[PDB]
UniProtKB/Swiss-Prot annotation:
Lineage of producing organism: Eukaryota, Fungi, Dikarya, Ascomycota, Saccharomycotina
UniProt record similarity statement: Belongs to the hexokinase family.
Region described as Glucose-binding: spans on this chain: 149-175
Designated gene of the protein: GLK1
The name this protein goes by in its record: Glucokinase-1
Start and end residues of each stretch annotated as Hexokinase small subdomain: 65-207
């Protein structure tokens, strides 16, 4: 056929093939029902003694009201940095901030055999510099003063035998230091704090970023938590979607069959009815019994991934992998002759479409909501910020693919929220019963319309579109810094 005839036939075939890839990417409401039911099943398997889900009790039996008073501290430590924050709760749904971001120490931790004393003394040194800098209010009263409660955000593998008690099991995503496999991390931090000179500091909390997100959403609840006035709604889920994904919710105390009955009765004999469970829902259905999977998901999880087959739901939802899936689809369609069709072979393609993760997520951000830009002006430009240029008929299908990837990730992200809301139902305060779930992270906050698709999925779930609209949801953003302080408050 003619060059023009072949071009037209090729464009029609690209229509076909891209629609077929989309069909292979779709999430049906039937699959939604299947996934949420299996998630309820994994939840109930998990928190009973032996496994369904890594549902780790966070040992928090109280939620902030947004009416709270006082000033508290918060320490967080990871491979990223070390941070000492200080929060002054104004007494309304507001607060005031102070903080020092002590950079991760330059190579006292690079797989050298260093003491817990070295690392935790660096932590306490930065805490002492903090106290000296912004207030020696009770630091000048170094012998004794009115104490200060602070929460610790130690985002490492930890065995939290209770609140303000953690027994570190390993340094993963960090580097191995000597003989901390049995130490209590809150105890080490407290020892180093009382050893530099502040004995006023009490380390009374230990939680990770998701429990902090939940507590930071309890505070600052849009005037829907101060009283049963206007909207009558309470927050029941904290969660982070983005580079990673996880969530936490409050479960009945006597429904956590895992914890021994001693602690359960000792809590219920108090005013204590519920406790926060940090559902590790990252790495959900790793066995892939129900979790949808395509070819590109396999080729990325196996070859290009650092966790070969461990956090599968994370990888299907994370913001890093969206652009990666798009890149693999593009390289596929090219090497099979349908797209970018005058780069005569692979390794003639631009340097970023060939190499692994060079297709970032802001690309999909710009592409997904392309307005009628006189047919893909900002989209062409931004997709062309990486070295490859494109044509209109190709850009239409590339937008199709990007939107399909995003919709799948959003519906999957909605599955666990729906399963939690339907396990602990939102229809128990029979009248005006409403529930808001607060969210942090990259994808959920800044990806265009990822919340609209979350809502559409929650409507298409066995959470009924009839009942989805008693759940409105928005963002609570600081969990390592404000959430730790609030976990110290409710300690």
């Amino acid at each position: 056929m003619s060059f023009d005839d072949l071009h037209k036939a090729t464009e029609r075939a690209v229509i076909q093939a891209v629609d077929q890839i989309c069909d292979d990417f779709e999430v049906t409401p039937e699959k939604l029902d299947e996934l949420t039911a299996y998630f309820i099943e994994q939840m109930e398997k998990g928190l009973a003694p032996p496994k369904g889900l890594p549902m780790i009790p966070a040992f928090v039996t109280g939620s902030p009201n947004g009416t709270e008073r006082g000033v508290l501290l918060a320490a967080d430590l990871g491979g990223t940095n070390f941070r000492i924050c200080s929060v002054n709760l104004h007494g309304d749904h507001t607060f005031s901030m102070e903080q020092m971001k002590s950079k991760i120490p330059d190579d006292l931790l690079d797989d050298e055999n260093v003491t817990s004393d070295d690392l935790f003394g660096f932590l306490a040194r930065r805490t002492l510099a903090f106290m000296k800098k912004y207030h020696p209010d009770e630091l000048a009263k170094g012998k004794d003063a009115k104490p200060m409660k602070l929460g610790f955000t130690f985002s490492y593998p930890v065995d939290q035998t209770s609140l303000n008690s953690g027994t570190l099991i390993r340094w993963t995503k960090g580097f191995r230091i000597a003989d901390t496999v049995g130490k209590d991390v809150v105890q080490l931090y407290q020892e180093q704090l009382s050893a530099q000179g502040m004995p006023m500091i009490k380390v009374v909390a230990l939680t990770n970023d998701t429990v902090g997100t939940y507590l930071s959403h309890c505070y600052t609840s849009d005037n829907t938590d101060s009283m049963t006035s206007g909207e009558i709604s309470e927050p029941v889920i904290g969660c982070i979607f983005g580079t990673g994904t996880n969530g936490c919710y409050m479960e009945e105390i006597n429904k956590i069959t895992k914890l021994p009955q001693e602690l359960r009765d000792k809590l219920i004999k108090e005013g204590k009815t519920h406790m926060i469970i940090n559902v590790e829902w990252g790495s959900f259905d790793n066995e892939l019994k129900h979790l949808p999977t395509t070819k590109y998901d396999v080729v990325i999880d196996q070859k290009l991934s650092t966790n070969p087959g461990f956090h599968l739901f994370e990888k299907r939802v994370s913001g890093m992998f969206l652009g990666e899936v798009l890149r693999n689809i593009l390289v596929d369609l090219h090497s099979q002759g349908l797209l970018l069709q005058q780069y005569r072979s692979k390794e003639q393609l631009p340097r970023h479409l060939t190499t692994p993760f060079q297709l970032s997520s802001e690309v999909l951000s710009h592409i997904e909501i392309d307005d009628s830009t006189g047919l893909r002006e900002t989209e062409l430009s931004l997709l062309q910020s990486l070295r490859l240029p494109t044509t209109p008929t190709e850009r239409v299908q590339i937008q199709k693919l990007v939107r399909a990837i995003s919709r799948r990730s959003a519906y999957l992200a909605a599955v666990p929220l729906a399963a939690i809301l339907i396990k602990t139902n939102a229809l128990n305060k029979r009248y005006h019963g409403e529930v808001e779930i607060g969210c942090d992270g990259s994808v959920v906050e800044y990806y265009p319309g990822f919340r609209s698709m979350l809502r559409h999925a929650l409507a298409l779930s066995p959470l009924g579109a009839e009942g989805e609209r008693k759940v409105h949801l928005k963002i609570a953003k600081d969990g390592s810094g404000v959430g730790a302080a609030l976990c110290a408050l409710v300690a």
